[PDB]
Symmetry: C5
């Protein structure tokens, strides 16, 4: 078949909607998420008009091969969607109602700056390319945009699923292209990061600071070096959950900063021992007593500064 | 073809059944399981009625393209099911008997609160969408619901496979949708968690408590810090088997609590050494002797409280 | 087409065979294995009989769509097999000879009780469902059962590939079902477990026992705790190669038992130090000297008991 | 169909273009990247020429099976591309305009010599094989070569996407083959390697050098051995992100060199202790004081030499 | 269609060739490699002979469904190859020239005895099964066997790609089967194993031997136990890259042997301490001084013996 012809010189308007049935597998490293959803399409084809009184039916059903259907695609998908047509309904004035159920793997960039206390705006870009015979333009039918109440994205809270109603119409390779932006707003469930990463990392750091109440060099070296190794393990664990970024993340900044605290603690432990061996313990004692206050204080202030810069 | 027309104005009833052939790959992190099963369908199509005496046959066989078949889907699947039609049988009054064998990857949420002593209710949601010409509604044929005796789900015990007989009828995108809930009740085989995670974690903790029978600071620091690192390793091992949850799991709560015991043990070991160096060993000895009882007692009471809150 | 009609009221016999071309990817955790094989089928269809003298040919060739073929399936496969038809030959009396080459992923439970010195019986279950017009029953053509000499399953020795010649005929959803059991007997190549897991695990344990020839508490704590951590690493390594079982495996039992030896060694090291500090070294020396014999002796006896219970 | 015949002796020119829609999953170990793109093709088929006045349309649309289409393939892809035809447009003189959207996994070798400060030239090779009746040759339509502004390759900066306009025409198996080279120039975002690998590795190394301000052998052995183990962990982490190369990478060279510094530091710590026990501390003190300067100086010079040899 | 009939009792010869376009993903653990290649086939079908003068064409082109094509398969593939037909050419005497491009995952056993200084012979087995009407036999057209100059197999050097010209003809299920052996000779790039595994493993071993220049038991235990743990880490790293073998590999033998050196070093360190505590240091000093020479000497001799047995 070929596209419906214009009454005059108007573009063909294709009304769209996406209804989310499942959202799963938000992969942070790949910056992808999987979706299973209804895609609804609506347009006018006057060649399909009929008389209700005469035909004795308010609606006709067609198979996809029998009529013209716009080639709708997703911009930001790995591979073309897996689609199954559910229904095609034609009303007497030639208004087509198309419904498919599809699944796809979507590429959408994530901003990790405030990880694990981050929020994201996932995008699903709908697109249509114009044909020689006619310009095709997309619109949003808001009554056919939504999500099922049970849609859960493990490790995330789903805030809203809306569409930017005005398309981005632009030229690509001498044809018009009409693009819509469907936006899925989500926020990370930071809860588990507290007992599993943040608090264990703070406990080992505070354990290293017990060295400031000890004159045993051998024990101090064991305290600071062992805890540092445990800190390295947490640093490695965290970076396996995340892609490499051309910026610092909030957690990355704290993790990095804690290395400086371990480094300065080793210097203090070394300086303390060196003075004692040199028969200057009163001086070592001044440095050690100051360290007992300076370490937790500088750690608290540095964290207030970091929280301020990031939030 | 198109749907069978009503004798009057009754909905079309599609009777369903699921017979489980295989259940495998319950993935805790993804909250998925794979299934291989029979789907049986039954409905009345009077246009297919025939005379047995005349035709000389009690049953007719058809191919799926020759007749009308309801578009049955699963709600909570990653991709549409892989289905192969096994048989279509039509009796003289036009009763169709449909049988397919399918495989699918099912999304079903898991409650990890009592992990690894948890039970789950897996769901398989069957669905059909109504057409303009007719409301289509699902029912359960209980004689065609079951599972093969050999179905094993590795790491789990299978309790029951039943269906909620009344469908959930509701409107979605201006059509009626009829949804059935097939429920697979399972309970986790907690056995291996005992020798592999729980007991080793208790042994290292009890080893750290030997420090309460030692005056050697250097040895004490080695005992408590080394065992803490081993505890971190078990914490990391456990969290790799589990998704991130917006709540505490029973194992997660014990693991987290044990960190506090390691932390207080380091404080005690530090306080003991500090007093001895200050020439107050009699006092250090009072704190150490009290710790020998306080640590195991507070550990037992805290575990009784946790078990009570979770079970 | 439809099934060949009975001369009287006999079931249709479908003769089967499986010839293994490749066996690969025995996955212990998933309890699966991949197979690539010939499936041979044979049955009588009298409607296809012809005269050899008249037709001037001993055999006719058909394409699968031209004739009736039984719907043969595998019970214990993840997804339906990937099949390609190789040949269909019809002899003058209407005997059909069918040959396909297929690949499949097979689910088959493994018994890990004697791991890594275990043997297994893998199963491939062939099945056919009877039709309304005729009962279909399976049989084994032993001349068409075997395996190629080069079939290798990495990490395993292949003993035999046989079929249980009598089918399991039973009712499932009001039709007869005919099931055959093809059995692939294999035994694990335990060799590499010796230099890679078993001996290293014994070496570190024996290294911990050097503490029974040392009065240095600090050194003893370092010896027993460090080796225990290495033992934890081997425990974790082993459990990553295995699924979770509702029973103890032989290796699992030894690994678990070794923890008790580490635990008692820490107690001995603690008791030794405590007595020396209390000015009772003669007594500490009695416990230490007894431990030098008791530890290796109790370890040898406990291993004889375990080997007896498992083998 | 078969290829359009020559007016007189000339090869058939197929004009090509690639417009990149998505670039993702640059896998360093596999030396692959995934691409989603438009492929545009243009050629003259005079057998498809038509009269606009007669046919009643100015352009004709066809399906791929209705006309002759050149067999265009990619050289360096794992499997044949997943392609969906978007449009086939024929103008009155028989000029065909072909447009498909495809996705593919591309093999392209990477040079890791300057990792993680490396740049790469990824290739997509387009190819066509000549037929008996006609030589087919490829060209670039520069107006149809480009990339969307949002194309992001996580962990990389995209510099340019251009084509080498002259094809490589050559004989393979007695036929002409026409090959085009599309080049995607990228540079690695080295940023995250600094806080995550490089600085932590320098901190632990500098911590080992505190041993040059200590006379405690026991503490020195703990300092140098513990930090060496942490260095091994970083070496292992880095090599998991990279393939095995028959040459040294810049990071690999620094990592390897640091082992020599740990080795010499152990020798120094051993020599120091040996002299002190032999009652030669004045001499040990000379070696230790020299080491305080020699270690950081030789480390700085060796790094200047390495940076010079690699950049 | 059906096979070309014999002039007189001679088998049909199918000439073959394989031209390698890409070799990738040699997976050591799975013993697989991926290939992308041309498969060329040639045979005589006299029923397709034509007169060039009469027909006015020197060559005819066909589609695969229009003529008889031999069912060529690969023996040692996971799944059937992904093939696309490029060209079918028929010359006037009825000589068919067939060309396809395919991709496949190939199973080929690897000999790890001399890992990582090993060479391998990968096999691609081509096969054809005879039909009732005709015996079919394979041959090699050497002019159509080759590889593109750019074919690279990451981590390997490609030496040669040749075919064993004489087929292996044998009976399987009462038909003749004709099998060709295409051989891809490769040698491992051992380079990176030196700086990444071999040298680090030697450095830690030599570090443990510093204990022979120390009288400090506590420091000695730290030196030998810490390095042993690092050795365990390298053993685990190496075994993750390799399948389990029923024989010792060269690297495996060195790794295993090094454990014995660590074990004897612990005995020496224990014996040294025991004698010193017993007031027999002169004797301890004799054992320690002998160990300084014995350890490196026995290590050198044992490595010469191992290299001799393996190479
Ligand atoms: C990149 C960061 C560099 C870190 C440098 C930190 C030095 C701080 C000086 C402390 C002042 C003090 O109080 O002690 C300084 C003492 C010297 O003491 P003295 O002069 O002999 O005693 C006083 C005698 N009267 C009576 C004459 C006054 O030296 C030390 O303790 C040595 C320990 C520092 C070693 C850290 C090494 C890290 C290696 C990294 C190389 C890249
Ligand atoms: C986050 C939780 C913080 C933990 C604090 C624990 C308090 C324990 C008080 C001990 C009571 C006691 O028995 O002794 C108090 C002693 C001081 O002894 P004295 O009073 O000087 O002697 C009396 C002399 N006459 C009788 C002759 C006059 O202090 C200590 O041993 C210091 C060791 C504890 C340090 C723990 C460091 C933790 C770092 C983490 C920072 C975020
Ligand atoms: C879950 C299992 C727990 C295992 C307990 C092992 C008991 C061994 C007793 C040895 C008998 C002996 O000979 O010495 C017992 C000695 C006391 O010696 P005394 O009696 O004071 O001296 C005699 C003086 N006269 C003769 C002059 C009168 O105390 C110890 O050495 C204590 C060290 C062991 C502590 C282990 C703590 C583990 C914490 C884990 C908590 C769950
Ligand atoms: C400490 C850990 C010690 C490990 C002991 C192995 C147990 C065993 O003896 O394993 C048994 C296996 C095979 O057993 P089977 O063939 O099933 O016997 C069936 C008997 N029925 C049917 C009567 C019940 O023999 C072996 O290959 C011996 C290799 C062991 C080498 C260990 C080197 C150290
Ligand atoms: C593969 C690299 C091997 C490295 C060899 C390093 C040589 C050290 C020379 C320093 C100069 C010095 O001053 O000390 C050298 C001293 C001997 O001194 P002395 O003769 O007793 O002193 C003078 C006394 N008079 C004046 C009375 C005569 O021995 C040591 O400290 C021993 C420690 C080094 C052991 C390292 C073991 C490495 C094992 C690895 C096996 C492959
Ligand atoms: C361990 C020692 C630390 C590693 C030193 C990195 C060497 C390097 O920085 O290399 C240089 C590259 C740039 O090189 P290019 O873009 O190829 O220019 C080649 C043009 N020439 C040939 C004219 C020079 O990195 C950078 O832009 C700067 C980031 C370095 C920060 C490291 C912090 C510590
Ligand atoms: C699996 C392999 C087992 C390894 C055993 C090797 C023993 C070497 C003997 C050295 C000869 C020597 O010179 O010293 C022998 C000394 C005893 O000396 P003495 O007679 O009391 O002294 C002389 C006194 N006069 C002169 C006054 C008479 O014993 C030791 O130091 C003991 C330390 C070795 C313990 C190793 C434990 C490993 C546990 C594994 C158990 C399965
Ligand atoms: C202890 C440390 C072990 C060192 C490993 C020895 C390697 C080897 O000996 O391997 C030898 C292989 C070549 O083997 P081939 O060509 O198959 O011999 C077949 C011909 N015949 C019949 C004569 C045997 O190549 C190499 O140049 C090895 C370079 C090794 C550098 C390691 C530095 C440390
Ligand atoms: C101890 C050393 C660690 C130092 C690391 C410091 C990294 C630099 C911090 C830059 C701030 C990044 O955080 C982001 O900034 C932009 C604009 O700046 C804001 O955007 C909303 C937000 O505040 C935040 O999402
Ligand atoms: C040491 C500090 C760690 C502290 C963490 C404490 C977390 C508090 C536990 C909340 C209990 C969650 O566990 C859940 O409770 C609800 C009712 O409330 C019940 O609900 C389902 O039946 C069950 O009992 C249990 O599945
Ligand atoms: C020190 C603590 C660890 C102790 C754990 C002990 C676990 C108990 C082992 C019971 C034996 C199980 O192992 C199985 O036994 C039965 C007979 O009983 C036999 O049955 C299979 O044939 C086999 O011999 C063995 O596969
Ligand atoms: C600490 C021991 C480590 C020793 C390893 C030393 C490696 C030697 C460096 C070889 C140069 C590699 O680096 C590469 O060389 C080529 C050509 O030489 C140069 O070009 O039209 C580049 O600068 C660089 O891409
Ligand atoms: Cl799409
Ligand atoms: Cl479905
Ligand atoms: Cl099947
Ligand atoms: Cl392609
Ligand atoms: Cl194949
Ligand atoms: Cl034979
Ligand atoms: Cl034959
Ligand atoms: Na259409
Ligand atoms: Na220590
Ligand atoms: Na139908
Ligand atoms: Na058929
Ligand atoms: Na075509
Ligand atoms: Na054919």
């Amino acid at each position: 078949v070929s596209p419906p012809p214009p009454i005059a010189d108007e573009p063909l308007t294709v009304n769209t909607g996406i209804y989310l049935i499942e959202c799963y597998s938000l992969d942070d490293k790949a910056e992808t998420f999987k979706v299973n959803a209804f895609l609804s399409l609506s347009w006018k084809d006057r060649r399909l008009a009929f008389d209700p009184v005469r035909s004795g039916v308010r609606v006709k059903t067609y198979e996809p091969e029998a009529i013209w259907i716009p080639e709708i695609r997703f911009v930001n998908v790995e591979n073309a969607r897996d689609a199954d047509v559910v229904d095609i309904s034609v009303s007497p004035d030639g208004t087509v109602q198309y419904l498919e159920r599809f699944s796809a793997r979507v590429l959408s960039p994530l901003d990790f700056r405030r990880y694990p206390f981050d929020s994201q705006t996932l995008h699903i870009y709908l697109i249509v390319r114009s044909v020689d015979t006619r310009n095709i333009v997309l619109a949003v039918d808001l009554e056919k945009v939504g999500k099922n109440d049970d849609v859960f994205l493990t490790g995330w809270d789903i805030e809203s699923f809306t569409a930017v109603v005005k398309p981005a119409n632009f030229a690509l390779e001498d044809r018009l292209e009409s693009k819509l932006d469907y936006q899925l707003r989500i926020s990370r469930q930071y809860f588990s990061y507290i007992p599993n990463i943040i608090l264990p990392m703070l406990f080992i750091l505070f354990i290293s600071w017990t060295a400031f109440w000890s004159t045993s060099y051998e024990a101090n070296v064991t305290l600071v070096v062992s805890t540092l190794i445990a800190h390295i393990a947490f640093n490695i664990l965290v970076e396996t959950n995340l892609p490499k970024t051309p910026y610092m993340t909030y957690t990355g900044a704290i993790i990095f900063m804690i290395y400086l605290f371990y480094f300065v603690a080793v210097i203090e432990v070394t300086v303390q021992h060196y003075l004692k061996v040199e028969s200057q313990p009163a001086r070592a004692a001044s440095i050690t007593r100051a360290s007992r206050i300076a370490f937790p204080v500088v750690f608290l202030l540095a964290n207030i500064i970091l929280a301020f810069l990031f939030f």
